[PDB]
């Protein structure tokens, strides 16, 4: 079935969202063994000791520290895109819609999942968020590349699951 | 006589002597009243006796007297009113009611809200912003009663006072109504010689925009007098400047013995109706002579229609004819009222339908922000009672009374309806009357009324398949009744067609918009939001003072001036054009998105009239008719 066939609502609602995630039950033994082991470590208390040791190590932070950091980042920083990073965004945004254009002309049917100007503003928002991560007043190309990586991992694989959006 | 009272009278006299603006404002009021009196004598309106006083200028003059008015107004306001009355009587010697005072300017810590008002602000001049919820009946209060004694044939009188008129409290002396004089003769009341002053009380609670979202709101009572009654209606956003007073004894008498406490209410000196987003107060602004000269300079240009339309929403690429339609709707056309009571529409209704993410809701929000009396409504959120009107019961009178819905409150304004396709059938039948007959007819239990609902309507719809299909017929795509499509003057189908060059242009425009910084802001600093409250009187960023494109605040001045000043009339050169276009369009063979009825001719007339209003022209010309026809032909084809 199409991704819009699985949802019990209009396909425009998917376009209202900035990023979509299709969560899959892959059903692999080497994966469910690991998941079950992780849940056992949750239940015994080994995960509690591991997380405390990792917080003391310095590669995880507390939830209250995260809350205060989120408040500080939202109240202090609001980045702006650099002029050199806009060309990459425009080019890699127009290539996707060119691919969807040729897919729609070949298939002669509208794709159930769309990508619009709202998705371009979504990728802009992701780039500005990644720039706001390090309290950076300006967004560089390394934020743009990572934002595009998240967009490919989130909305574009969902579009590829749509066989109108694939091909 | 009090020494400090006289000293404060002299100090305010010196302040009024320093600032001549209040003096010749008094003189202007007096000469206006005298001119109206002379016109009534030879062959009307009367101005109230009060003066707007800027507190900032007073702080510049005398800080002690300014802080005296703000902190202890009961000792400082009556001397200032006495000094103003003496000055006004001094200028009235060559050509009776005492003059009052109104306060404007920054209040500092005294600019409060009904939640923020506590008893430390009692007996102080406070400015309170909020929303009017209850407005009591304007009742006459008897000040002086005049009586006639027929045995002696003499006219007696008695004066009555209460605690709400004077700021400083005095001894309450209850003088009863005199029905017999000293010698015992019968007194007959002479109505028409007695003096009655209008009195109102309103309830102002905090506005829901800055009220806390969880808990109950707080409200205060405001007492208004003869020149301040009927300045408000429920639902208005107001700023009331007045003395936060306490009255009576809080149960400390033996007869009173309860814990209502000391009753607290504001003796209102000034009422400002402020314009907020999607409220019942129309946005009005002062037009200076420089602005009128600039508007007249733009009226003579030949590309003015292409300048005002493209300068509406420069952050939205394309949709130029939609901008033109929105501008012509904001012009509003001209309505006709005949001698037999018939009414002909002037307002223009615009419907836009098409693919998602095509800047429809952003255009709706723009028209909400840029129109004088635009009110926003969604599809399923509002119902039949919320749109037209509803009936409740008054607590005091005990009878039924009316609540004006979204469409009635936007009289002479714009109704911005988003998600038009999801509205209920009863809503559609209710709005069939409003879009054409321009009224709301209420026939409920005991209430049969007709409310004026003269509005312009913008609607944004969505095709039932989610995306517009080119090969399909438009009747199946729109999926709306034919009557509703006939009500709308213009219907615009927007298609999100993909083209590489066009998508490059859209992406470049969006990124250039996303590389914007406000003036006076740093690179990393987030832009702060201040809630927009305006007083109601009576892709290039650097658009400032008509350089290439008109800025939004000047565009509102242009729209306001074109609405109040120019009322164009039709001429035969435009008439032949519109008749030819209408009779051609009725007999065209090509399939149109909108069906063609006799309403299309009136849409042509309204669009021509609106384009004439753009040109600031007393008449409708042939080019206006051509523009009106060519704008409608795009919406039809
Ligand atoms: N032609 C356009 N020019 C600029 N921005 C656009 C355009 N079309 C859509 N957008 C952007 O897409 C976003 C989606 O909102 P909107 O398009 O108003 O939704 P809808 O079309 O469903 O009303 C908006 O933030 C707007 O900035
Ligand atoms: Mg929308």
DSSP string, B430-481: HHHHHHHH-EEEEE-SS-EEEEE--EEEEEEE--TTSS--SSS-HHHHH---
Q: How many helices and strands (H and E) does chain B possess?
A: 19, 23
Is residue B375 a contact partner of residue B409, using CB atoms and an 8 Å limit? yes
Say how far apart CA B630 and CA B608 lie, in whole Å. Answer: 11
- The answer to whether the Cα torsion of A66, A68, A73, A75 is positive or negative is positive
Say how far apart CA A101 and CA B625 lie, in whole Å. Answer: 40
- The answer to whether the Cα torsion of A119, A121, A122, A128 is positive or negative is positive
3-state secondary structure of B402: strand
Is residue B305 a contact partner of residue B608, using CB atoms and an 8 Å limit? no
Cβ neighbours for A65, distance < 8 A, ≥ 6 positions apart:
none
Is residue A19 a contact partner of residue A155, using CB atoms and an 8 Å limit? yes
Taking an 8 Å cut-off on Cβ atoms, the answer to whether B510 and A120 are in contact is yes
Tokens of B341: 């009571």
Q: How far is CA B342 from CA B335, B337, B429, in A?
A: 11, 6, 22
**Chain B residues near residue A83 by CB distance under 8 angstroms:** 515
Q: How far is the CA of B346 from the centre of ligand 2 (A)?
A: 28
How close is the nearest chain A Cα to the Cα of B315, in Å?
13
Report yes or no: B522 at the A interface, CB cutoff 8 Å. yes
Report yes or no: B230 at the A interface, CB cutoff 8 Å. no
- Which ligand is in closest contact with the Cα of B503? 1
Closest CA to B207 of B256, B277, B255, B152: B277
Is residue B241 a contact partner of residue B268, using CB atoms and an 8 Å limit? yes
Asked whether residue B361 is marked as a ligand-binding residue, the answer is yes
For ligand 1, atom 27, name the residue with the nearest CA: B359
Cβ neighbours for B284, distance < 8 A, ≥ 6 positions apart:
B275, B372, B536, B537, B538, B560
Asked whether residue B354 is marked as a ligand-binding residue, the answer is yes
Cβ neighbours for B92, distance < 8 A, ≥ 6 positions apart:
B30
Say how far apart CA B625 and CA B609 lie, in whole Å. Answer: 9
Strand B448-452 versus strand B534-535 pairing type: unpaired
Q: What are phi and psi of B504, to 5 degrees?
A: -60, -45
Asked whether residue B359 is marked as a ligand-binding residue, the answer is yes
Taking an 8 Å cut-off on Cβ atoms, the answer to whether A94 and B507 are in contact is yes
Q: Which atom of ligand 1 is nearest to the CA of B506?
A: 3
Find the distance separating the first CA and the last CA of chain A, reported in whole Å.
15
Taking an 8 Å cut-off on Cβ atoms, the answer to whether A117 and B514 are in contact is no
- Which ligand is in closest contact with the Cα of B494? 1
Cβ neighbours for B28, distance < 8 A, ≥ 6 positions apart:
none
Taking an 8 Å cut-off on Cβ atoms, the answer to whether A114 and B503 are in contact is no
For ligand 1, atom 1, name the residue with the nearest CA: B317
Say how far apart CA B620 and CA B331 lie, in whole Å. Answer: 14
Cβ neighbours for B61, distance < 8 A, ≥ 6 positions apart:
B15, B18, B19
Taking an 8 Å cut-off on Cβ atoms, the answer to whether B357 and A116 are in contact is yes
Strand B100-104 versus strand B111-112 pairing type: unpaired
Taking an 8 Å cut-off on Cβ atoms, the answer to whether A90 and B511 are in contact is yes
Report yes or no: A110 at the B interface, CB cutoff 8 Å. yes
Is residue B488 a contact partner of residue B459, using CB atoms and an 8 Å limit? yes
3-state secondary structure of B273: strand
Check pocket membership of B359 for ligand 1, CB cut-off 6 A. Answer: yes
Strand B263-275 versus strand B219-224 pairing type: parallel
Q: Select the residue from A18, A90, A144 to test the B interface by mutation, using most B Cβ atoms within 10 A.
A: A90
Chain discontinuities in chain B, listed by preceding residue (C to N exceeding 2.5 Å): 43, 95, 257, 538
For ligand 1, atom 14, name the residue with the nearest CA: B357
Strand B439-443 versus strand B448-452 pairing type: antiparallel
Report DSSP state, residue B187: E
Burial class (CB in 10 A: 0-12, 13-18, 19+), B416: buried
Strand B455-461 versus strand B413-418 pairing type: parallel
For B33-53, the DSSP string reads HHHHHHHHHH------SEEEE
Asked whether residue B356 is marked as a ligand-binding residue, the answer is yes
Residues linked to residue A80 through DSSP beta bridges, in sequence order? A138
- Which ligand is in closest contact with the Cα of B512? 1
Report yes or no: A120 at the B interface, CB cutoff 8 Å. yes
- Tracing tokens 């509003």 back to the chain, one arrives at B332
Which one of B357, B366, B368 would you pick to mutate in the ligand 1 pocket, going by the greatest count of ligand atoms within 8 A of its CB?
B357
Report DSSP state, residue B616: T
Say how far apart CA B107 and CA B125 lie, in whole Å. Answer: 9
Q: What are phi and psi of B222, to 5 degrees?
A: -125, 125
Taking an 8 Å cut-off on Cβ atoms, the answer to whether B511 and A80 are in contact is no
Residue of A nearest to B518 (CA): A80
Is residue B143 a contact partner of residue B162, using CB atoms and an 8 Å limit? no
Strand B139-149 versus strand B195-205 pairing type: antiparallel
Q: Can you say how many angstroms the Cα of residue A21 is from the centroid of all Cα atoms in its chain?
A: 7
Tokens of A11: 């396909």
- Tracing tokens 């993909």 back to the chain, one arrives at B498
Say how far apart CA A10 and CA A7 lie, in whole Å. Answer: 8
Closest CA to B261 of B75, B74, B122, B114: B122
- Tracing tokens 């009136």 back to the chain, one arrives at B602
For B147, other C-beta atoms within 10 Å of its C-beta total 21
Taking an 8 Å cut-off on Cβ atoms, the answer to whether A116 and B469 are in contact is no
Asked whether residue B165 is marked as a ligand-binding residue, the answer is no
- The answer to whether the Cα torsion of B127, B128, B132, B138 is positive or negative is negative
Q: Which atom of ligand 1 is nearest to the CA of B460?
A: 23
Tokens of B560: 């306001």
Q: What is the resolution of this structure in A?
A: 3.2
Say how far apart CA A15 and CA A165 lie, in whole Å. Answer: 14
Taking an 8 Å cut-off on Cβ atoms, the answer to whether B356 and A135 are in contact is no
- The answer to whether the Cα torsion of B268, B270, B271, B274 is positive or negative is negative
Closest CA to B404 of B365, B368, B439, B371: B439
Is residue B568 a contact partner of residue B618, using CB atoms and an 8 Å limit? yes
Q: What's the angle, vertex CA A97, arms to CA A96 and CA A99, rounded to 5?
A: 65
Is residue B104 a contact partner of residue B127, using CB atoms and an 8 Å limit? no
Residues linked to residue B241 through DSSP beta bridges, in sequence order? B127, B270
Tokens of B302: 């030949």
Closest CA to B278 of B452, B528, B532, B453: B532
Say how far apart CA B352 and CA B459 lie, in whole Å. Answer: 6
Query: Chain A to chain B, count of Cβ pairs less than 8 Å apart?
Result: 82
For ligand 1, atom 19, name the residue with the nearest CA: B357
How close is the nearest chain B Cα to the Cα of A85, in Å?
10
Report yes or no: B497 at the A interface, CB cutoff 8 Å. no
Report DSSP state, residue B550: -
Is residue B65 a contact partner of residue B15, using CB atoms and an 8 Å limit? yes
Check pocket membership of B357 for ligand 1, CB cut-off 6 A. Answer: yes
Closest CA to B418 of B462, B387, B459: B459
In CATH terms, the fold of domain B1-110 is mini-chromosome maintenance (MCM) complex, chain A, domain 1 (3.30.1640)
Say how far apart CA B484 and CA B491 lie, in whole Å. Answer: 11
**Chain A residues near residue B470 by CB distance under 8 angstroms:** none
- Which ligand is in closest contact with the Cα of B509? 1
Burial class (CB in 10 A: 0-12, 13-18, 19+), A26: exposed
Is residue A58 a contact partner of residue A65, using CB atoms and an 8 Å limit? no
For B566, other C-beta atoms within 10 Å of its C-beta total 19
Q: What's the angle, vertex CA A121, arms to CA A115 and CA A123, rounded to 5?
A: 80
3-state secondary structure of B492: strand
Strand B237-247 versus strand B263-275 pairing type: antiparallel
Say how far apart CA A109 and CA B327 lie, in whole Å. Answer: 37
Tokens of B563: 């609405």
How long, in residues, is chain B?
Answer: 637
Say how far apart CA B493 and CA B3 lie, in whole Å. Answer: 77
Select the residue of A10, A86, A97 nearest B503 (Cβ to Cβ). A97
Burial class (CB in 10 A: 0-12, 13-18, 19+), B627: buried
Q: How far is the CA of B377 from the centre of ligand 2 (A)?
A: 13
Report DSSP state, residue B568: -
For B356-374, the DSSP string reads SSSSHHHHHHHHHHHSSSE
Q: Which atom of ligand 1 is nearest to the CA of B356?
A: 22
Is residue B149 a contact partner of residue B187, using CB atoms and an 8 Å limit? yes
Enumerate long-range contacts of B561-564, CB under 8 Å, 24 or more apart.
B561/B287, B561/B292, B561/B295, B561/B616, B562/B331, B562/B613, B562/B614, B562/B616, B563/B331, B563/B332, B563/B613
How close is the nearest chain A Cα to the Cα of B630, in Å?
29
Closest CA to B124 of B103, B143, B139, B140: B103
3-state secondary structure of B111: strand
């Amino acid at each position: 079935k199409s991704p819009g066939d699985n949802i019990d609502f209009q396909t425009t609602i998917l376009s209202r969202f900035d990023m979509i995630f299709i969560v899959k039950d892959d059903h692999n033994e080497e994966r469910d063994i690991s998941i079950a082991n992780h849940v056992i470590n949750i239940h015994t208390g080994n995960a509690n000791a591991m997380q405390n040791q990792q917080e003391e190590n310095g590669s995880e932070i507390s939830i209250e520290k995260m809350k205060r950091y989120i408040t500080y980042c939202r109240l202090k920083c609001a980045p702006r895109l650099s002029p050199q990073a806009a060309e990459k965004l425009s080019s890699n945004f127009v290539t996707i819609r060119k691919q969807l254009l040729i897919n729609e002309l070949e298939s002669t049917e509208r794709s159930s999942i769309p990508i619009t100007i709202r998705q371009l503003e979504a990728i802009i928002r992701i780039t500005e968020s990644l720039a706001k991560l390090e309290l950076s007043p300006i967004a560089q190309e390394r934020h743009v590349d990572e934002a595009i990586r998240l967009f490919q991992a989130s909305t574009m694989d969902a579009a590829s699951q749509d066989p109108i959006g694939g091909l | 006589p009090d020494a400090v009272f006289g000293d404060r009278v002299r100090r305010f006299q010196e302040f009024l002597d320093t600032f001549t603006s209040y003096r010749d404002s008094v003189r202007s009021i007096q000469v206006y009243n005298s001119n109206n009196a002379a016109n009534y004598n030879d062959d009307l309106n009367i101005l109230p006796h009060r003066i707007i006083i800027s507190l900032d200028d007073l702080r510049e003059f005398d800080r002690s007297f300014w802080s005296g008015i703000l902190v202890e107004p009961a000792y400082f306001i009556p001397p200032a009113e006495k000094a103003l009355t003496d000055l006004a009587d001094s200028m009235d010697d060559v050509p009776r009611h005492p003059w009052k005072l109104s306060f404007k300017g920054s209040f500092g810590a005294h600019a409060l809200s009904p939640r923020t008002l506590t008893a430390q602000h009692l007996n102080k001049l406070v400015s309170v912003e909020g929303i009017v919820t209850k407005t009591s009946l304007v009742r006459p209060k008897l000040i002086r009663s005049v009586h006639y004694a027929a045995k002696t044939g003499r006219f007696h009188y008695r004066d009555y006072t209460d605690a709400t008129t004077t700021l400083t409290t005095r001894i309450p002396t209850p003088a009863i109504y005199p029905t017999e004089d000293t010698e015992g003769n019968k007194l007959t009341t002479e109505y028409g010689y007695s003096t009655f002053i209008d009195h109102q009380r309103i309830t102002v609670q905090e506005m829901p925009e800055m009220a806390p979202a969880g808990q109950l709101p707080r409200s205060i009572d405001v007492i208004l007098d003869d020149d301040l009654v009927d300045k408000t209606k429920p639902g208005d956003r107001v700023n009331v400047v007045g003395v936060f007073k306490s009255l009576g004894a809080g149960g400390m008498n033996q007869s009173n013995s309860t814990l209502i406490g000391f009753k607290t209410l504001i003796l209102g000196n000034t009422v400002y109706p402020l314009h907020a987003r999607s409220t019942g107060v129309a946005a009005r602004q002062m037009l200076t002579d420089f602005d009128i000269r600039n508007i007249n300079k733009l009226s003579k240009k030949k590309d003015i229609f292409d300048i005002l339309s493209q300068s509406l929403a420069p952050s939205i690429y394309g949709h130029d004819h939609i901008k033109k339609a929105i501008l012509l709707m904001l012009m509003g056309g001209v309505e006709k009222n005949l001698e037999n009571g018939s009414h002909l529409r002037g307002d223009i209704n615009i419907l836009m339908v098409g693919d998602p993410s095509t800047a429809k809701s952003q255009l709706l929000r723009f028209v909400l922000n840029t129109a004088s009396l635009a009110i926003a409504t969604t599809g399923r959120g509002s119902s039949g009672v919320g749109l037209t009107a509803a009936v409740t019961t008054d607590r005091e009178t005990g009878e039924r009374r009316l609540e004006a819905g979204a469409m009635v409150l936007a009289d002479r304004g714009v109704v911005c309806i988003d998600e038009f396709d999801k509205m209920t059938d009863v809503d559609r039948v209710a709005i069939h009357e409003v879009m054409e007959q321009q009224t709301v007819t209420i026939a409920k239990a005991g209430i049969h009324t007709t409310l004026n609902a003269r509005c312009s309507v913008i609607a944004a719809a969505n095709p039932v398949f989610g995306q517009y299909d080119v090969n399909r017929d438009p009747h199946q795509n729109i999926a709306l009744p034919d009557s509703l499509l006939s009500r709308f003057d213009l219907l615009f189908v927007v298609t999100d067609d993909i083209n590489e060059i066009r998508d490059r242009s859209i992406s470049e425009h969006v990124l250039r918009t996303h590389r914007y910084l406000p003036p006076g802001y740093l690179e990393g600093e987030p832009v702060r939001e201040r809630l927009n409250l305006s007083l109601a009187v009576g892709g290039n960023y650097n658009g400032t003072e008509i350089p290439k494109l008109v800025t939004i605040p000047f565009l509102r001045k242009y729209v306001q001036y074109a609405k109040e000043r120019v009322i164009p009339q039709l001429t035969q050169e435009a008439i032949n054009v519109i008749v030819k276009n209408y009779t051609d369009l009725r007999n065209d063979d090509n399939t149109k998105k909108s069906p063609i009825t006799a309403r299309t001719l009136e849409t042509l007339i309204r669009l021509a009239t609106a384009h004439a209003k753009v040109r600031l022209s007393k008449t409708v010309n042939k080019v206006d008719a051509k523009v009106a026809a060519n704008l409608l032909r795009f919406a039809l084809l």
